[PDB]
Every structure is written in C-alpha cells, then in structure tokens.
Swiss-Prot record:
<keyword id="KW-0456">Lyase</keyword>
<dbReference type="InterPro" id="IPR022485">
    <property type="entry name" value="SHCHC_synthase_MenH"/>
</dbReference>
<dbReference type="Pfam" id="PF12697">
    <property type="entry name" value="Abhydrolase_6"/>
</dbReference>
<dbReference type="GO" id="GO:0070205">
    <property type="term" value="F:2-succinyl-6-hydroxy-2,4-cyclohexadiene-1-carboxylate synthase activity"/>
</dbReference>
<dbReference type="GO" id="GO:0009234">
    <property type="term" value="P:menaquinone biosynthetic process"/>
</dbReference>
<comment type="function">
    <text>Catalyzes a proton abstraction reaction that results in 2,5-elimination of pyruvate from 2-succinyl-5-enolpyruvyl-6-hydroxy-3-cyclohexene-1-carboxylate (SEPHCHC) and the formation of 2-succinyl-6-hydroxy-2,4-cyclohexadiene-1-carboxylate (SHCHC). Is also able to catalyze the hydrolysis of the thioester bond in palmitoyl-CoA in vitro.</text>
</comment>
<comment type="subunit">
    <text>Monomer.</text>
</comment>
<protein>
    <recommendedName>
        <fullName>2-succinyl-6-hydroxy-2,4-cyclohexadiene-1-carboxylate synthase</fullName>
        <ecNumber>4.2.99.20</ecNumber>
    </recommendedName>
</protein>
<dbReference type="InterPro" id="IPR029058">
    <property type="entry name" value="AB_hydrolase_fold"/>
</dbReference>
<keyword id="KW-0474">Menaquinone biosynthesis</keyword>
<dbReference type="GO" id="GO:0005829">
    <property type="term" value="C:cytosol"/>
</dbReference>
<comment type="similarity">
    <text>Belongs to the AB hydrolase superfamily. MenH family.</text>
</comment>
<comment type="pathway">
    <text>Quinol/quinone metabolism; 1,4-dihydroxy-2-naphthoate biosynthesis; 1,4-dihydroxy-2-naphthoate from chorismate: step 3/7.</text>
</comment>
<dbReference type="InterPro" id="IPR000073">
    <property type="entry name" value="AB_hydrolase_1"/>
</dbReference>
<comment type="pathway">
    <text>Quinol/quinone metabolism; menaquinone biosynthesis.</text>
</comment>
Length: 255
C-alpha cells in the first residue's frame, strides 16, 4: 500500500529539547497520554498509535521486531534524533522491547504497567491460552460483547459501573480484527524475559506505579527499580492522578 510509518500526533516544542514519545495500551489510542504529556509544553511530543489501534489500525505486524522496526521508521521520518519513550501497559512492553533491541537517539525509557516478561514455559503457556481465547473473541464476536466482559477483569475491579459502561462504549470504537491480530502478535506469551537485558542496560530506565497497583510495584522491585509511587492511584496512575504523574515525570525528565 506504499511506504508506511505509524500514525501519530506531533506537537513541536523548543528546538534543542528532546521529544517525548508516548505509547498507549491495548485497545487505546494516541489520546491516552495527552492529558499528562501536554504539560510538557517546552518539549516536543509524539503521541503514537500502535499497530491495530487508532490511525494505525490498518498496519499489521507479526511480532515485536515488526513493531520496533515501524517505531524506528516513524522516528526517522519525523527527524526525531533525541527522545524519551514513555509507555503504558502494552506500550510499556513495546518501549522496553524496542529499547532493548537498540534505538539511536534514545535518552531513556519510562514505563507504567509494563510487564518485563514471564519466566518459564508454564506461565507462557497459560498466558498464551488466555490471550488466544481473547483473540478468538475479538475475531468473532461483536466488539461491545467482548469489551463488556473485558472490563469485568480483576485489573478493573476498582472501577464503578458507569466507568465500565463508558469504557465499553469508548473502546467499541476499534476494529476487532486488527485488535485481535495485534493482541496475538505482541502477546506477553511470546515476549522474552527482559530482566537480563534491563539489568545490562546502557539507557536510563524509570518505573511509575499507582500506590494500589501491588502487581506492578512488585514487578518494578524485581527489576531493581525504585518505583515512583503515585498516590491515590491504581492500575492506570496517569489517568487517575495526572498531576501526580506529571510531577514524577518532571522530576525524572528535567534533572
């Protein structure tokens, strides 16, 4: 279909300052990080749509290598030469994979909710089982029906009914086929265990955790990261406490 890059929204800041390149989570889009990112009016900001999502819905990938290649291509096309990657959940995993492969111009990586990888064949088989079942639902069921159950998952337990309904309605603005393909392609089941790579890193790496997010606080500690704990926040700290996340990002980026 032609020479492709990822769809993204660019905001230009001061010349000489780095770009902040933001990566959303599964089912989301490039609006995910804008409430937080637009606080950094002096930086340039790139809000990327991952394959299968937003304006990148028609861009398919077979795995992380394809995603990393597309991200690299996109950065080159925008002439982004110095940048931070900031990723939430799947976007955090994309950021870690790309940084570990190696990206020219990378200043550092900041992750919220990004799993560094499973550690044995057993955990992987089970995540593969779970992801395959979701994939088949996204591939065959009306999106609203799938998302209705999606938001009943334990990670969303802290939500109320109005919030769940809102999210179901919002995320039903996606395509099921492209979401399914991306879910499969970048499944945690096929991701390497990045602990060794992260330990041996030559780039800066920071972790943000909602106070209530015990799962990712534990994972951040496994990565020997001193997590920036965001008060009054759970599984999506940048959404639940945007001012707190802005403060933490300012502490990290500006010093």
């Amino acid at each position: 279909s032609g020479s492709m890059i990822l769809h993204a929204q660019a905001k230009h800041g001061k010349p000489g300052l780095p770009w902040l390149v933001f990566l959303h989570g599964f089912s989301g889009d490039c609006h995910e990080w804008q409430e937080v990112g637009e606080a950094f009016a002096d930086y340039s900001r790139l809000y990327v749509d991952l394959p299968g999502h937003g304006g990148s819905a028609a861009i398919s990938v077979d795995g992380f290598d394809d995603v990393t290649d597309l991200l690299r291509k996109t950065l080159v096309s925008y002439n982004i030469l110095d940048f931070w990657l900031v990723g939430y959940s799947l976007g955090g995993r994309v950021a870690m994979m790309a940084a570990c492969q190696g990206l020219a111009g990378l200043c550092g990586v900041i992750v919220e909710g990004g799993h560094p990888g499973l550690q044995n064949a057993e955990q992987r088989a089970e995540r593969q089982r779970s992801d395959r079942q979701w994939v088949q639902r996204f591939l065959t069921e009306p999106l609203t029906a799938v998302f209705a159950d999606w938001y009943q998952q334990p990670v969303f337990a802290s939500l109320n009914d109005d919030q769940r309904r809102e999210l179901v309605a919002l995320r039903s603005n996606n395509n099921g086929a492209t979401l399914a393909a991306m879910l499969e392609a970048t499944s945690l089941a096929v991701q390497p265990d990045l602990r060794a790579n992260l330990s041996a890193r030559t780039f800066a790496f920071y972790y943000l955790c909602g106070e209530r997010d015990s799962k990712f606080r534990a994972l951040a500690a496994e990565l020997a990261a001193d997590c920036h704990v965001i008060p009054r926040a759970g599984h999506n700290a940048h959404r639940e406490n945007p001012a707190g996340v802005i403060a933490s990002l300012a502490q990290i980026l500006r010093f």
